[PDB]
Amino acid sequence: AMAGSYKKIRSNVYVDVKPLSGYEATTCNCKKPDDDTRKGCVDDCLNRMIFAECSPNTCPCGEQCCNQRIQRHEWVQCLERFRAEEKGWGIRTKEPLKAGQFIIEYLGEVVSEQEFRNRMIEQYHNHSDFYCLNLDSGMVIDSYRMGNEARFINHSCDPNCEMQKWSVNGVYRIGLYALKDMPAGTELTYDYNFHSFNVEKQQLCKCGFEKCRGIIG
């Protein structure tokens, strides 16, 4: 099997909805570290603490703010698409990744719950194959047709990555972050049961984890 084709996008395509968070969180009290060399808003950050990215024009740390990862597309660069046992295609990293590190934004079309169920009737044959993540209050990020390499990341009952919902300039967007340190050649995975949507067509899980749950979704 050849990999699924899709329309690569650099950012989310908003169709019929706006997943506005309800706050432009601004202005932490992080102190700008004195030499340009080092990066700020690291752990104590009043923005980070609530999963909000800082805004470039209010943040006391200016260009050393490391809390604007998704807005600046600070995607890792060593992802490879590969043929992955019986899971079809997967994504692995070519170089070690550290716990908590941002990996990539998960990109797609942002549609309402309704619109996704139409696509599912009119186009998808009532199975999305987990090419879609819940975003917020009935909105869905649909990567079945448009997205980025993150759509190829497989499920594991013992995931080494997770999806996080961030408020970014007043809009919910979703990052993949490492849950644990990872060496080169490691396949990326996250728990679809937590992050993905309602699809009642369950599928057998091949994650191969001692305590695998046997089924996905």
Ligand X SMILES: C[S@@+](CC[C@H](N)C(=O)[O-])C[C@H]1O[C@@H](n2cnc3c(N)ncnc32)[C@H](O)[C@@H]1O
- Nearest residue (CB) to ligand X, 24 versus 162: 162
Q: Residue 47: name the closest of 61, 33, 37 by CA.
A: 61
- Please report whether residue 145 would count as binding ligand X according to CB under 6 A: no
Pairing of strands 79-83, 7-8: unpaired
Judged by CB under 6 A, the residue of 4, 62, 185, 214 near ligand X is 4
Q: Which of Zn ion, ligand X, none has residue 13 at its interface (CB below 5 to 8 Å by kind)? A: none
Q: Report in angstroms how near the CB of residue 160 gets to Zn ion at its nearest.
A: 13
Smallest separation (angstroms) from ligand X to the CB of 153? 6
Closest CA to 194 of 150, 149, 152, 164: 164
Give yes or no for a contact between 85 and 119, defined as CB atoms under 8 angstroms apart: no
Interface residue with ligand X among 69, 155, 173, 195 (CB under 6 A) is: 155
Q: Which amino acid, one-letter code, is at 192?
A: Y
The region, left, alpha or beta by phi > 0 then psi within -120 to 50, assigned to residue 12 is beta
**Identity of the residue, 45 or 157, whose beta carbon is nearer to ligand X in the bound complex:** 157
Binding site for ligand X (CB under 6 A): 4, 87-89, 129-131, 151-152, 154-156, 203, 205-207, 216
